Design an enzyme around this catalytic site. Structure first.
Site, PDB file in Angstrom:
ATOM      1  N   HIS A  66      -3.184   1.384   6.590  1.00 51.72           N
ATOM      2  CA  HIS A  66      -3.673   1.721   5.446  1.00 51.72           C
ATOM      3  C   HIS A  66      -3.373   2.599   4.571  1.00 51.72           C
ATOM      4  O   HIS A  66      -3.646   3.905   4.828  1.00 51.72           O
ATOM      5  CB  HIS A  66      -5.295   1.208   5.389  1.00 51.72           C
ATOM      6  CG  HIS A  66      -5.876  -0.073   5.147  1.00 51.72           C
ATOM      7  ND1 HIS A  66      -5.653  -1.042   6.096  1.00 51.72           N
ATOM      8  CD2 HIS A  66      -6.117  -0.864   4.294  1.00 51.72           C
ATOM      9  CE1 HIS A  66      -6.273  -1.869   5.736  1.00 51.72           C
ATOM     10  NE2 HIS A  66      -6.395  -1.972   4.575  1.00 51.72           N
ATOM     11  N   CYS A 105       0.617  -1.102  -0.116  1.00 55.09           N
ATOM     12  CA  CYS A 105       0.125   0.555  -0.177  1.00 55.09           C
ATOM     13  C   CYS A 105       0.540   1.192  -0.003  1.00 55.09           C
ATOM     14  O   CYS A 105       0.248   2.197  -0.879  1.00 55.09           O
ATOM     15  CB  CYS A 105      -0.957   0.013   1.687  1.00 55.09           C
ATOM     16  SG  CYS A 105       0.187  -0.189   2.988  1.00 55.09           S
TER      17      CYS A 105
END
Ligand SMILES: *NC[C@H](*)CC(=O)OC
Lengths: 145, 75
Positions: free
Chosen positions: A138, A52
């Site tokens: 995230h 990510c």
């Protein structure tokens, strides 16, 4: 308590902070994480499954994740790029600081606890990253409200 | 004694700890004051990143001595 990078074979020299090995105008104390000077060339490590952070950096700097990963392999030892943390929790903001030093930018991380800065201030490029507590953290491009 | 902690968001917290207090319990008290888990806590005393398995007395930290906090955000 024991450290894997202490006897890492892809790095030379003793344990020193990242700011001493590669000095810049980093945000205060954001570069004090310990590491070692890279010895061996790029081992061609595979792209981390939890990628990510690489996608978030790529969406901002237009640099492919492959080149960023190769630069991380050139700057950091393998034991700090792909380990048990990399495949379970994912990449850290220390890799973000290393990439900010290599590519000259100051990333602005918009976490759940507020905005933080990572990377040399003596730069021009300014990227923005959104951080989510999740679980887990995230990484996305841009900012949120 | 009583010390201070300067965070990555500019906020300077005031904490009360023992001279023989471990860095892990200091991070736990920081988690109490703010809510930051010890997973994302790295404490620094004048450039040197402190180790969890040590105490304040080992680094010669007196009262009213400020400690910097850096977030090690994973993900
Ligand atoms: N922390 C690793 C990246 C998270 C992720 O890939 O979510 C899709």
């Amino acid at each position: 308590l024991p450290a894997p990078l202490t006897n890492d074979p892809t790095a030379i020299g003793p344990v020193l902070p990242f700011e001493e090995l590669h000095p810049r105008r980093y945000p205060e104390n954001t570069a004090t994480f310990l590491t070692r000077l890279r010895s061996l060339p790029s081992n061609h490590l595979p792209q981390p499954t939890l990628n990510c952070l690489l996608s978030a950096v790529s969406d901002q700097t237009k640099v492919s994740e492959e080149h960023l990963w190769e630069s991380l392999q050139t700057i950091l030892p393998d034991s700090q790029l792909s380990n048990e943390e990399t495949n379970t929790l994912g990449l850290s903001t220390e890799h973000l600081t290393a990439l900010a030093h290599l590519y000259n930018f100051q990333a602005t991380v918009y976490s759940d606890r507020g905005p933080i800065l990572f990377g040399p201030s003596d730069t021009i490029k300014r990227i923005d990253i959104t951080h989510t507590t999740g679980p887990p953290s995230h990484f996305s491009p841009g900012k949120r409200l | 004694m009583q010390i201070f902690v300067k965070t990555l968001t500019g906020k300077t917290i005031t904490l009360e700890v023992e001279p023989s207090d471990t860095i892990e319990n200091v991070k736990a008290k920081i988690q109490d004051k703010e809510g930051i888990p010890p997973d994302q806590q790295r404490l620094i005393f004048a450039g040197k990143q402190l180790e969890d398995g040590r105490t304040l007395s080992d680094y010669n930290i007196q009262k009213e001595s400020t400690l910097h906090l850096v977030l090690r955000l994973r993900g």
